[PDB]
From a paper:
COPII mediates Endoplasmic Reticulum to Golgi trafficking of thousands of cargoes. ER export is mediated by the coat protein complex II (COPII), which minimally comprises five cytosolic proteins that form two concentric layers on the ER membrane—the inner and outer coat. The inner coat layer consists of the small GTPase Sar1 and the heterodimeric Sec23/24 complex, whilst the outer coat layer comprises the rod-shaped heterotetramer Sec13/31. Here we visualise the complete, membrane-assembled COPII coat by cryo-electron tomography and subtomogram averaging, revealing the full network of interactions within and between coat layers.
We therefore analysed the structure of the interconnecting rods by focusing the refinements at the mid-points between vertices. At this resolution we can distinguish helical profiles and individual blades of the Sec13 β-propeller. Surprisingly, we detected a previously unresolved extra density attached to the rod halfway between Sec13 and the dimerisation interface. The size of this appendage is indicative of a full domain. The average of Sec31-ΔCTD rods recovers the characteristic features and has similar resolution to the wild-type rod, but it lacks the appendage density (orange arrowhead), confirming this density most likely corresponds to the CTD. Since no atomic model for the Sec31 CTD has been determined, we built a homology model to fit into the appendage density. Rigid-body fitting the homology model in the appendage density shows consistency of size and features, although at this resolution we cannot determine the precise molecular interface. We show that Sec31 CTD is as an essential node of the outer coat network that binds to Sec31 α-solenoid domains. When the truncated form was the sole copy of Sec31 in yeast, cells were not viable, indicating that the interaction we detect is essential for COPII coat function. In contrast, when the cargo burden was decreased by deletion of the ER export receptor, Emp24, Sec31-ΔCTD supported viability. This phenotype is similar to the depletion of the Sec31-ΔNTD or of Sec1326, and leads us to hypothesise that Sec31 CTD binding to Sec31 rods stabilises the COPII interaction network, thereby imparting rigidity and strengthening the coat.
Numbering used by the authors:
A (entry chain A), B (entry chain C): 379 to 469, 495 to 690, 694 to 745
C (entry chain B), D (entry chain D): 2 to 157, 170 to 292
Amino acid sequence: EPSPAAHWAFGGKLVQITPDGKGVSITNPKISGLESNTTLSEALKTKDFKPLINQRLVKVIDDVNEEDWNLLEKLSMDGTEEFLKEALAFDETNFQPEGDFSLSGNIEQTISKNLVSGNIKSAVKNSLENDLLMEAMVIALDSNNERLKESVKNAYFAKYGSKSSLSRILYSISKREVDDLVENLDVSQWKFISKAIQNLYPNDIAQRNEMLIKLGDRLKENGHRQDSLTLYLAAGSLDKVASIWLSEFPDLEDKLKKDNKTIYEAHSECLTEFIERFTVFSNFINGINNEQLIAKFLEFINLTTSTGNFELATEFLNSLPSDNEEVKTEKARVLIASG
Amino acid sequence: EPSPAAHWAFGGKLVQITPDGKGVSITNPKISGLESNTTLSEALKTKDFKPLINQRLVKVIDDVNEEDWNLLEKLSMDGTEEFLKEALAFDETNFQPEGDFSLSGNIEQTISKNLVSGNIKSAVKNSLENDLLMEAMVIALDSNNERLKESVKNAYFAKYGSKSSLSRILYSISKREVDDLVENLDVSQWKFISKAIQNLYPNDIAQRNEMLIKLGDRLKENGHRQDSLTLYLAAGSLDKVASIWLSEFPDLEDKLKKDNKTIYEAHSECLTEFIERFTVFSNFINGINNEQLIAKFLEFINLTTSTGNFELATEFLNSLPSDNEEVKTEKARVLIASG
Amino acid sequence: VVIANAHNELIHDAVLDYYGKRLATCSSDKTIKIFEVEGETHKLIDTLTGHEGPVWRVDWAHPKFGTILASCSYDGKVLIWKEENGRWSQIAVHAVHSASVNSVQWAPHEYGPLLLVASSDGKVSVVEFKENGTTSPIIIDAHAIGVNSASWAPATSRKFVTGGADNLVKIWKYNSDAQTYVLESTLEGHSDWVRDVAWSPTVLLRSYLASVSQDRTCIIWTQDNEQGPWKKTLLKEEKFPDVLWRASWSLSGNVLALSGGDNKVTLWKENLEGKWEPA
Amino acid sequence: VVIANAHNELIHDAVLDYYGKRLATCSSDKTIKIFEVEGETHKLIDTLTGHEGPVWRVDWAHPKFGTILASCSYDGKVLIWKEENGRWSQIAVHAVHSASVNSVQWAPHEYGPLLLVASSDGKVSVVEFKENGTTSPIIIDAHAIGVNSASWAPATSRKFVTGGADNLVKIWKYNSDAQTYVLESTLEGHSDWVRDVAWSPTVLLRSYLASVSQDRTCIIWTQDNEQGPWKKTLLKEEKFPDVLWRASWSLSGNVLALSGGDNKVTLWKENLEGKWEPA
């Protein structure tokens, strides 16, 4: 019997037989809902995601998602460097002696004698071995002798760095370190632990970023999501931002599925938003080795080839490690299919 | 008519005529009370005033006089240097931070930001412009910057060097000076203003002694007679000690005149004690241009020549400025008289 | 893009290969034709000869085995074809059925180079090509009257659906303690011959089957999971104008392509309700 | 130290000079002799000749004028002598009195080279030696009967004490509105001729005078200050054995040397009481 004998083929092509029963007709049917991604293809080339960003922003989903695109909307204009700036910054002498006086007590007399007797060293010892720290410090703030000029600091902290937050901070600024702040100073004052990293490690980037990272993790893990991303954006750790976003993926596809969308519309829409959100973000930072990311990368490939847009598909194919066979195979297939 | 026709002549010589009426007889009569000064002549040569000192000490007059000879009795054994020694000498770290804390207030936050932002300079400014001097000092006790490492000292004193004697003393030790102590610190703590001179001027003797002197005057003029002499003995100012002793002369000759002695015994005894006391003292210090002293020097000469001891007389004649005519004349007279 | 007059006798099958660039047809003339389509052009590349009767269907194999094409015909045999060095040649031949073979299909490339064959003789055959070349297949009696189609389920444990002229649709699963494919489920729902059956490759929890029949209706069979039964769902409440002859699923989107007798092709997709509608 | 037989006639005076080393004597032989004494030796150096009568006294002048010696004699004249280039020679001669000159004395070197002379003619003469040499003296009537001695007061205003044979002692002071020495005070206290008077050179507030007399007593006259009168004080309550002939004060210590007629020399000093005793 006569019949179209229709079939689907790679690239979203439809093969059928003409009514005359003697001809073959290949085509690319218009599937309402499925459209090659132009914006992405065109922005990925003209590297101007103004429109793409403006699209996602104007049709964003949940509140959180809006921040990310806004984070990207402004990162778009101001630029990476200028962004991290506005994001990591912030909002009596005299005395004239008078009248008679006298060395009262043994303590005073002993220290005084030391001084005059040019024995600046002992003066401090005798001072510390009494609660005349203020003085001990004053004498030391006059000599050059470092070990002495330091035997007092370690003496101040010794009994104060624990009764005063500013004391504990000094203790750290003094001893050229951040480990303490970075790990115990309240996360709310992060923009500070932030300056203590750029301040202590201004010429050692590897360390500067190992610390900035160590902080981001702490922020994100203690309610500062938006901020931990800022720190990451400055540490050049796309991996951390990727990981966060991959964990937030499910719940995101769920809020879409409840929004009157078929299992496919949701899955489709989701993977697209994530891919466009990841692409634009990876375009401003200093950054594939994450399995799931790769896995989901491959996924977007197929949805793209099915749109017939083999060009945008290859672009993402390139960015994947040519070490992965699935990546290998699809690389070859897309080639012949288009070539 | 026949007669001895007696006469007195220089050197205490008595010329008379023999009973035979044809002979002349010159002699040196024994005047009970007048005796050539051997001890002085013998000690002035063997420069060992142990005996002389032991003589005056065992037959001293008033209490004050006793101190001077004792001052000389001990100065005799111990020696000048060793004397000025025994006479000018004298009789918590840790802190471990704990728990949450936070930058409370604008002040703290501003200073903290400064620190981390490697801006050690501003931190201090913001500190001083608040009563956070203790801190301002702590920051400065960490940098090398002198002008800053000093902008605080001048800030401490500015409002404390007047409410604390030890503060005012520091102010001086700091600014390498003594003028303040030397002129206002209580005379009772002189052994201190003493160490502040040897301490600040250890390689500038002219100044060291100009100050030591400036103090001695203050002591002696404020009840510290015995002590001002010690300072003078170390400044090498025989002139000051001489002047004090010449003013104390009268009263001294008076206490002797009330002690059952003729106007002469007193005057005689006095000038001798003063001369032996001055000789032994000038023999341990680092030292004539004082009129009265000269004047009284000449006086002892005559009393000595009258004893027939022309040798001891010449000795003192030598020590006088061969610029003084009276000194000139007597120098010549003593010569012929003995030669 | 149209390639008019690819054959002079009526054509029964046209399939594009793994890259959707290499065409292939078959018809009553008892021959197959290889084409190369680009934009809106085309170039014949060869004409396969051998079948003693009209050729019913063809199926391209996975590239990982080479460039092969399989065909079956009213002649009751199946011929595999190869394009080695630039020329097509009959490598093997499968003929164990005693009546027209109506469908043939290459299993998923994971199973290896296996072929699913269905015939009017009521049997279905599973064929692999030994290390040496020859063939030692599996033959099962799967439908009374005749079998018109057979499709492989995607890979995980291996299953395939057949569609007979006994109006039934049937799922098959391989069993060890039998060394054969055993009948897992019989799905009743057509009142006339089942012409074709297509198992969707969709990788979602739910499995989709689409059977087409001489009764002018399409049924989408679905199974939520192993504990679920196969639920029947007519493609549309009203019967169609003519006999439905074929069913084909896209590779993505799970979109069904229905080929009617009124020589018309309708396209469908599923919606929130679980009911189909024009895509 | 003794120089026996310095003269063969009785000797009346022996005085040592400013250095107390150069001796000088005089006696009836009408000559003076210069000696040089050391330890216990002596060497004559010359014999002065000229006086026509026994020589009574001699006085050495202050070295600042040269090496001079003055003498006076019963011959009523005074001769000055010099030792220039190594030899003594009569430079000048003073003779204005009409009777024995008994004393002569050089004023304090501050007044210049003045000479105090006293004579049995009752007068006293003051003599300086002009720029050219000659002499234009002061002559005053100072005692009835005769003047036996005269001594100069130490320097500040110039005063000197005389002692006559009228038993009186007398202080004299120079006056401008008279161009002469005027009688300032008369001290009564001896009952017989006054043989000598000595004004002590002591530089103490109090002035001391010592007069010796033919009455066998010595009197020490003292004056506390200008407002005080001259107080009489016998050297000792009991008279002496013989006539006191001379009085001499040491240069220091204010010790008095009394020369008696029993050719004995007593020495005295003052004590807390203001009374004298053997020194």
